């Protein structure tokens, strides 16, 4: 339950650093990212190793590692 | 710039079309092969007439008409070490691993960008070589970050200000005043009167084909996608060895060639067997996707804007064929019949073509993605007969700016509805196809046009829209009628393709916050009179129109992904394990193709329902009264009723008064609705939808 | 779901009506338009009540309701047409987890005494800031000339 540091990459090319514990829901990390980047929680989602991440599940289920990368994917319109 | 393209199999045709649309200065195309029937299933520039002719000469005029300002030229003869040196980049499609090696070695020995693109069946392969030292200017694809400043001072480590982005540390920034960049506390002047950052170029080294083939380096987003790519590469090498040894490509679905291909490679034996069996034709969606990717790589090898791709890219879509618990196509079924579909029939069969000939589909929006979807539909054969057809609906006219993104639009075709001209072009692709244009927006004001009879024939909807409100409305209509939905979205270089299948996937969840921003009223007091906080002071006069110029590579990719989804959507019932949503960022070489989520269930006091479910209650012979309706609800289900309303008007309330309730309880539902709303009931409407809430939620379908 | 929550909240509001609201009424045809009559306590606004509308958006949770007045009130926070600015209902402050009761109580606070911070009517703001006596003397006359019959 010790804190672990991970990397979250956004759509602008940057990769910020977050400190999270592998016992909380993905919704909490989504709220953290929303606060740090100033976008709504319903306007994007997260991806790691291809498959997306479900909001209600703990981060320990997916099996993250220290200094891992988690991508943001916006919900885009137009066409 | 000048680009050489060798091999117009259809992948080369897609690449050339993308380059001409983007605006490549000069394009020299080289193909001596004569056009046969088995080449029309993916090439959209040829025809039945242009048969027994060289592909290059046949397609030259069609490519030239697209832009008329790029001067497309055709080369006849052979490629020697004399014409290679005159072109900035050479693209090669469907070679024989001998011309590949020769041209690759010659290009590396002379320093010219070399691309190899191949599409065998459903699998695609791409390879790039930009040379031993390539420099790229701006690997960001986004505007450089900016910040505001107030005042500064002097200090040995330096002092910086920040008035309210993150600039990290040690990078390079600019503004002392209008001078060279200084690394950063800012790295003799004590005074005080915005700040912008700059990016560094990146250097990348590539190897020649002969060296790269020995040990590949594939682009994969995870670790389970690397062994799969290695198996695909081994299968491609085995196929090339088989072609060189026997002198002929393996026969379609032939079980005797698959054994030789498998034994030659020896690893995923099942995977190589399956790709060997299905490696007989070229399909429009896979060709369109790989052509979009290759065109983007070529374009980024000229402007030197985004980061070059790595050594290899492998695209695998082996879920469009019938599942394991089904019947595989047979060699007799997958036999050439002299019709313009032999490319698809070589892998699927005539039964699939018969199935696809009858379906009727609806297409919302004849625009950027719409034209590509129409082209893919025309080349595959959705309809093209008397038992099927296609419908196209759009509301906008044609403006001058549409010409730069005009796949099917012409300069003389301005001032007339887009749906008509798009239908005319789709008919030109093959006269067998029948397309009906409708110039009426699909919004909650023309619902009488699109009634129950209108959706009684439609077997599926493809949406290509530039809004969130319209997309949510279309999804709501589709889930009301229980129909498959195919949605796509592009912005700049980002693209997404999604499929929504009733009762097996999740319903389209629109972002409510985003849809609220559009069509926002005038801000009365946020910033109108006193304040001026950010750069958005433009609202005072009345990002102004939210204009996003899409590039032709993303639209082709999303259209190809949608077609790949359709291939198994029209293939009967599927176990939801054979469906995919796709997200792509071309500039960063990002591509994910994942399995969607099962629908989420909700439980109330005793009610377990999904987003697809609904409540169905009939009526009596003359009619049934409201009290009878509530009694039947409370009898069949445990649900009581607190509020029951129809749209913006309410018919019942949990507590009003004994008198107010007894006034309304003995009345007919239709009579009550006519009493509240003076407008007459719709004669064409058959089912009335009601919204109800229990004491303390799927709609109520009142079958009139 | 903008027609369900409005009627689900009107019942709760009528269950425990606030002391400053009277004749809280709907139309029963469109459930997205309300009506009320409020009598402010602070003088010279204690004489007559004022009518208003609580018009709702087609997506109420993700948009602010319009609270345009209907009477001819003279106040340095409302326009001559009837519109009124509230910081609670704004693009930078609106939230989907706020009820209409808080909006109306903030409205009551605003109408109790002008905030003289972001006045929409610039003419009356200066008169209030400089000479409150004349503004108070004229507001009562304006209310008498145009106002409700009784609370
Ligand atoms: N709900 C809708 N019904 C019909 N056409 C639509 C709808 N929403 C968007 N469109 C059209 O779809 C096209 C999208 O533009 P573009 O993204 O440039 O292809 C435009 O022609 C729009 O008018």
Residue numbers in the entry:
A (entry chain I): 79 to 157
B (entry chain A): 33 to 196, 201 to 211, 220 to 228, 237 to 239, 243 to 248, 252 to 324, 341 to 616, 845 to 998, ...
C (entry chain L): 2 to 152
Text from the published report:
The enzymes responsible for ISG15 conjugation were first described over 15 years ago and include: the E1 activating enzyme UBE1L/UBA7, the E2 conjugating enzyme UBE2L6/UbcH8, and the HECT E3 ligase HERC5. Reminiscent of linear diubiquitin, ISG15 is composed of two ubiquitin-like domains fused together through a short linker sequence.
Using cryo-EM, we obtained a 3.45 Å structure of the UBE1L-UBE2L6-ISG15 complex. To prevent non-specific crosslinking, the non-catalytic UBE2L6 cysteine residues were mutated to serine (UBE2L6C86only), which was also utilized for UBE2L6 in a recent publication by Olsen and colleagues. The adenylation domain, which activates ISG15 via ATP-dependent adenylation of the C-terminal glycine, forms the largest contact surface with ISG15. Interestingly, we observed density extending from ISG15’s C-terminus into the adenylation active site, indicating the ISG15 C-terminal glycine is adenylated in our structure. The last domain, the UFD, adopts a well-characterized binding mode for E1-mediated E2 recruitment, where the UFD engages the N-terminal helix of UBE2L6.
